[PDB]
Design a protein around this ligand. Structure first.
Ligand SMILES: [Co+2]
Length: 258
């Protein structure tokens, strides 16, 4: 019926409705650190989020998105392996039912507790919808979360979750600064890939940060309290909303560092 992460509609069944699931440039992948090639020609990433305008938070039934105003060049990503400017449209997470799983990308087969995705679209395409039809339409920054110390900058997000518990709920969410979610180092890995949920379009340049951020157990615990279901439907906790690693095929992972 419609896709999800359960036994009957989970990642292993997505190919029936979205044949691109068995495509040549699917994500996520396992990052083999000894095989990634250092590329001295990659430029440092440039993150300009000081003018970011958040608008809302929404439970879409598969995760929660914080949405931003992308009508102008307010929060952009450039440099790194990118050509042109990419505007932030939304961020969301993928997490597990336990601390030993949750990330989409793995590092030398290591799974993290969760993974943050900051989604950006190439301004040359004019809107998000046109950008998803192009091989270079999106740029996603992926950041791993491990459990340790609490992340101060994440608390405002944790605290509104109660108000968007079930599918379709939303809440005003203004003045959130996504700079509070970045690790200290911007060193990264990059490879060409796809969105990790249907429609699984291969339009993404992934930028995966080497340094994870830490969150406390209590913070991640609040994520696991969300629901996949709509209000008044039987309760299915929103956990394990991650897709397993896909074959690398004909692709090379490049590193911005050694
Ligand atoms: Co994602």
């Amino acid at each position: 019926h419609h896709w999800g992460y359960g036994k009957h509609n989970g990642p292993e069944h997505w190919h029936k409705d979205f044949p691109i699931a068995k495509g040549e440039r699917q994500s996520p992948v396992d990052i083999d650190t000894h095989t990634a090639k250092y590329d001295p020609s990659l430029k440092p990433l440039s993150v300009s989020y000081d003018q970011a305008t958040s608008l809302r938070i929404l439970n879409n039934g598969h995760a929660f998105n914080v949405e931003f105003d992308d009508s102008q060049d307010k929060a952009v990503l450039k440099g790194g392996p990118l050509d042109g400017t990419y505007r932030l449209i939304q961020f969301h997470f993928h997490w597990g039912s336990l601390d030993g799983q949750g990330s989409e990308h793995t590092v030398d087969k290591k799974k993290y507790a969760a993974e943050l995705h900051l989604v950006h679209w190439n301004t040359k395409y004019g809107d998000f919808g046109k950008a998803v039809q192009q091989p270079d339409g999106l740029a996603v920054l992926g950041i791993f979360l491990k459990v340790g110390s609490a992340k101060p900058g994440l608390q405002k997000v944790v605290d509104v979750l109660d108000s968007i518990k079930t599918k379709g709920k939303s809440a005003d969410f203004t003045n959130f600064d996504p700079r509070g979610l970045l690790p200290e180092s911007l060193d990264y890995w990059t490879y060409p890939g796809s969105l990790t949920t249907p429609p699984l379009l291969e339009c993404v340049t992934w930028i995966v940060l080497k340094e994870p951020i830490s969150v406390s157990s209590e913070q991640v615990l609040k994520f696991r309290k969300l629901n996949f279901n709509g209000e008044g439907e039987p309760e299915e906790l929103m956990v394990d909303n991650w897709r397993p690693a896909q074959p690398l095929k004909n692709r090379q992972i490049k590193a911005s560092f050694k």
